[PDB]
């Protein structure tokens, strides 16, 4: 099941979004990689 999930997360843009979308560059797409844990992980130069 997790193997197929790692397979399916590939080639699937995912729309990350935050609450107060003040400007246009507030909702974007990303490619998901199946990290362990219980939190979503983000690139360190889209946090602006």
């Amino acid at each position: 099941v997790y193997d197929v999930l790692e397979e399916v997360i590939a080639e699937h843009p995912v729309l990350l979004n935050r609450a107060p979308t003040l400007h246009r560059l507030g909702i974007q797409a990303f490619e998901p990689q199946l990290v362990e844990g219980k939190a979503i992980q983000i690139h360190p130069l889209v946090c602006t």
Binding site: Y2, D3, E6, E36
Partner: protein, 230 residues
Amino acid sequence: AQRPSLTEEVVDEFRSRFVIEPLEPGFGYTLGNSLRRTLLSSIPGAAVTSIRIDGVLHEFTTVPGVKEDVTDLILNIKQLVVSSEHDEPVVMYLRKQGPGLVTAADIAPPAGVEVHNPDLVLATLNGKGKLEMELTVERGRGYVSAVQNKQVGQEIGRIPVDSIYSPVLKVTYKVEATRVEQRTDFDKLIVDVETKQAMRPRDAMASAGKTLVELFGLARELNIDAEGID
């Protein structure tokens, strides 16, 4: 788990990539940095160490007949790769007359000593040639700094040139994660190295492995233990 192994990827005849298979967590660092430093400062070889440019003084900047200045002579000669089977300081000669340019193909080798880059361009000359100097090949390992070797003291003509006995020239070691049966935190080692034309990197792997295996057998010999591996 599964027994790891090694794979090599060829890109050119001077640099190559090595991959050490998915490793147990943390041990990627047990391998990488030690492999880097052992490849760097363990394997020996032959190199220049001191030369005698004829008819010059340290207070004199350039040299007549050759527009090339002293510093770039050092920079051009220290790149001369050389192998030896002598193990003591030899002294060998290099001369040239007439206009043109002196390259790496007109140096009269002594017994046993061989140079592996005959196409190296050394200097350019115009008019009267009068080029002659003697260079000293030594054997050693690592990278020796330009310390005053007390050769200038007894003779003005002596000048010491630093060298790189090490076949390896540049090294890059990294660790990256991979999935092995729903286990992703496992590590995996990458080592990409550029080694000069003296010998292929795989022989450097052999020699570094010999050194490391010896230096850890020196600790394994304390006893015989039932640890469990392979």
